[PDB]
């Protein structure tokens, strides 16, 4: 188990995320679904000229996981994941200067939902979370957990649990007051209002 400091910048995104008085939380599904959508356009891309980069999974799709009993929600795709170094370097974005201009926008007169412009949507999963866990699997590493609660901190191990074959499981360990987000119905509502026009299928699993 390895343990890192988040940037300054990032703590910062984090607390701010955590703590801003904000009721359209509901944007998060949007946030998660529009980055499984990118990175499953990023292997499907690879594929186009290298067919054995779908040895590891041809499906090509987004899985909504709702548990009740565990209060978690997790998001599965099947995209091109990430490597170790993806994890640490704050989950493959560019998030320094994203936060800085997410910032900037803010001050200015722009709202929290306006997050993903910026490359940072991850972060959003904070508005409904208090733990998140990103499960990895990328053709050129192995599979990785990242884990954090926010305060400063996140840890990366080697996953020993169920291997993916390729992608990324986003488990949010959502709030006690945002158990909405376990709902079928508001979930459903959601993706139809937000997530639209992905060119995947996104299945929502009932339990
Ligand atoms: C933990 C954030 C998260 C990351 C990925 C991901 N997997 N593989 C890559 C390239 C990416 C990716 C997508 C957008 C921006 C940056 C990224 F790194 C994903 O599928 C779903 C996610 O909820």
């Given at each position: ?13 984090m ?16 946030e ?25 999974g ?52 722009a ?81 139809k ?15």
């Amino acid at each position: 188990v390895e343990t890192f400091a988040f940037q300054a910048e990032i703590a910062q995104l984090m607390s701010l995320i955590i703590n801003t008085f904000y009721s359209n939380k509901e944007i998060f599904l949007r946030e998660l679904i529009s980055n499984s959508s990118d990175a499953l356009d990023k292997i499907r891309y690879e594929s186009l000229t290298d067919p054995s980069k779908l040895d590891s999974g041809k499906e090509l799709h987004i899985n909504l996981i709702p548990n009740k009993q565990d209060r978690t929600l997790t998001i599965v795709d099947t995209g091109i994941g990430m490597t170790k170094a993806d994890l640490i370097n704050n989950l493959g974005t560019i998030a320094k200067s994203g936060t800085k201009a997410f910032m900037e926008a803010l001050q200015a007169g722009a709202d929290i939902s306006m997050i993903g412009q910026f490359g940072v949507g991850f972060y959003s999963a904070y508005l409904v979370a208090e733990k998140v866990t990103v499960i990895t699997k990328h053709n050129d590493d192995e599979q990785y957990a990242w884990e954090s609660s926010a305060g400063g901190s996140f840890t990366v191990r080697t996953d020993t649990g169920e291997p993916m074959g390729r992608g990324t499981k986003v488990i949010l360990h959502l709030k006690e007051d945002q158990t909405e987000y376990l709902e079928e119905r508001r979930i459903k509502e959601i993706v139809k209002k937000h997530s639209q026009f992905i060119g995947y299928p996104i299945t929502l699993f009932v339990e």
